[PDB]
């Protein structure tokens, strides 16, 4: 390559190895200069301290700024030393790279500054040595997600209420609607559970209560639900992508059972389907998701650790299969022998893997207790495997949310500061109109703008 | 803040009245 110039004579020497076999004109060296070395210590001071290095060492990488003829922009003539106006520390690592070819990266450095000084000198990040590259990439990743959170969000007719419809703590109508719909979800689910209570829809007194009015009590809620979903269909930034999301899926799953049951009872009386309707008559609990801030956090936590939960399920099936088979083959020959089949030993091994314990069926043979205890221990292990991952992800997500809120407050403060700075500059110009070197020409250009439009500036 | 709570009071009393009317009309 171009960074092995110091070994150039050695290759020349290697040529002597094939002189006897050589057959050619031997084009002879092309008028090289200074046969004996007259390398001078070129000094590079970077806003302060000075680094001395050779010229061949500094020129072996011509694609960069310290190579090529670009550096001659920074030659400071009356002192004969390149006066770079950069940081006096990172430049040490850049010089180290020129010496070796594998640039390094210490930990105690801000990424923005280090990358700015690295790109200024024309270097590119991928040259970092493999030893420090991992830590560099991790730091770059965390700063990148910080700037992503920086660039995410800002606050901004009939379609405008959507802004208040995703931040209900914005207007009186939005907040009252949010609170009342939460109350309606709650009263619907409570209405379900109190329909189930024996004093609500059971023969408490056959000869005498069973108020069928619950049949109407839920209905209004469903109707109520429709209106806000209709609003979601009215103020929809996306007509189809909104449905592609999951919250609308929960909404429609909540809405449908009432309507499908009405259609069925208008046309059919299928046995076993009305109970399924009752079962599905509960998922408004998930409709509570918008009110609960932590529910979205939990959902994202589960979605993030999908692989871990999948391995949980696989290992659970593993253990259930193995231990249920062992139980059935080691306990089917007992007197009572409630282990009538492996599909029945599934329940025993799943209530002993979870360390639950019911005692409805327990082993009664010495060949049974051993594997029962081993199954309990293995259940502790298997179930405890993914919980640290899940909880770590949840804590991390909660931290991201809280830091994003603090960051948004910080961004509001920063934009306020920028507005204040512009106001201060305008007031300074006003004072200059009433009666530093830079401000002179700045106000001169402002006067030029004033005259080119013949309109003056007031407070 | 509290005005929104009064708005809740209004909407809840309205819905309670209408559902009371609904439950009162049916058992004829």
């Amino acid at each position: 390559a171009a960074g092995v110039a110091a070994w150039l004579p050695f290759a020349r020497a290697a040529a002597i190895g094939w002189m006897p076999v050589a057959s050619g004109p031997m084009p002879a060296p092309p008028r090289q200069e200074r046969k004996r070395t007259q390398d001078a210590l070129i000094v590079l001071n970077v806003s302060g301290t000075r680094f001395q290095t050779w010229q061949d060492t500094l020129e072996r990488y011509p694609d960069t700024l310290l190579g090529s003829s670009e550096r001659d922009f920074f030659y400071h003539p009356e002192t004969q030393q390149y006066f770079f106006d950069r940081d006096p520390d990172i430049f040490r690592h850049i010089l180290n790279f020129y010496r070796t070819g594998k640039l390094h990266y210490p930990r105690h450095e801000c990424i923005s500054a280090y990358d700015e000084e690295l790109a200024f000198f024309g270097l590119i990040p991928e040259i970092i040595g493999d030893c420090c590259y991992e830590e560099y990439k991790d730091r770059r990743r965390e700063n990148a997600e910080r700037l992503q959170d920086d660039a995410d969000t800002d606050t901004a007719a009939r379609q405008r209420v959507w802004r208040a419809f995703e931040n209900p703590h914005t207007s009186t109508m939005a907040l009252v609607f949010y609170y009342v719909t939460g109350f309606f979800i709650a009263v619907s689910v409570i209405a379900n559970v109190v329909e189930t209570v024996p004093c609500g829809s059971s023969p408490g007194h056959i000869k005498e209560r069973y108020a069928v009015a619950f049949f109407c009590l839920d209905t209004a809620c469903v109707m109520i639900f429709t209106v806000e979903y209709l609003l979601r269909l009215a103020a929809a930034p996306s007509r189809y992508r909104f449905v592609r999301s999951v919250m609308s899926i929960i909404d429609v799953v909540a809405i449908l059972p009432y309507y499908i049951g009405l259609v069925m009872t208008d046309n059919e009386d299928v046995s076993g389907a009305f109970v399924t309707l009752r079962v599905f008559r509960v998922f408004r609990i998930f409709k509570f998701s918008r009110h609960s801030q932590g529910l979205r956090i939990l959902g994202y936590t589960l979605k993030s650790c999908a692989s871990e939960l999948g391995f949980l399920l696989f290992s659970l099936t593993m253990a259930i299969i193995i231990f249920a088979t062992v139980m059935f083959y080691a306990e089917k020959g007992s007197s009572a022998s409630k282990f009538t089949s492996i599909p029945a030993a599934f329940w025993y091994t799943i209530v002993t893997m979870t360390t639950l314990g019911y005692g409805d069926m327990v082993p009664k043979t010495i060949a049974g207790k051993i594997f029962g205890s081993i199954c309990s221990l293995s259940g502790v292990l298997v179930i405890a495997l993914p919980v640290p991952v899940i909880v770590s992800n949840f804590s991390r997500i909660y931290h991201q949310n809280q830091r994003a809120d603090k960051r948004r407050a910080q961004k509001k403060a920063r934009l306020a500061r920028i507005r204040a700075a512009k106001s201060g500059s305008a007031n300074a110009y006003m004072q200059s109109k009433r009666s530093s070197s830079f401000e002179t020409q700045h106000h001169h250009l402002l006067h030029c703008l004033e005259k080119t439009t013949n309109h003056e500036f007031v407070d | 803040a509290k005005g929104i709570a009064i708005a809740l009071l209004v909407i809840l009393v309205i819905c309670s009245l209408i559902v009371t009317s609904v439950i009162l009309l049916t058992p004829a």
């Binding site: 106006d85 700015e116 703008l449 | -």
Partner: protein, 176 residues
Amino acid sequence: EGLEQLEAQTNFTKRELQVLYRGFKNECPSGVVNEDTFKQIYAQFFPHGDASTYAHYLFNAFDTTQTGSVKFEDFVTALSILLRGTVHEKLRWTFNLYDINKDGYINKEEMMDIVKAIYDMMGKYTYPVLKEDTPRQHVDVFFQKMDKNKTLDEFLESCQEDDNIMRSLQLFQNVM
């Protein structure tokens, strides 16, 4: 290059050239400036209104070959011809800047968006209270100073027929 580019492509002294280069590099270390940096700098010079579109026009004039991001060579060439060249070079640059397309003639809408780029600079804190009325009186007056016939050469000869515009150029020529 900086070693041969002393006056071949510029009218700047070596020290002025290198200090201007360092000033440019401190803002765009990659060595090539984009349009967003143009809005940032130009607005930061005028922290009282909005002039994003005027900076857009300025960059489009600066950005030759429609590359999307001008290097230092063309930038310093434009600065040299603007600040320490001949008046014909300034008039050619005004041609290029005002010619938002690649046409020859100049129409109403070009003065429309230029005068908007000028008038939005102030804001809403001026005594005369600028409105939509003033820009097209200004453009109309330009048009009576422009040829009656529906010309870049006419605009030129009008520039060297008025003393005020001719003297409106040297006061920046000498300094810096």
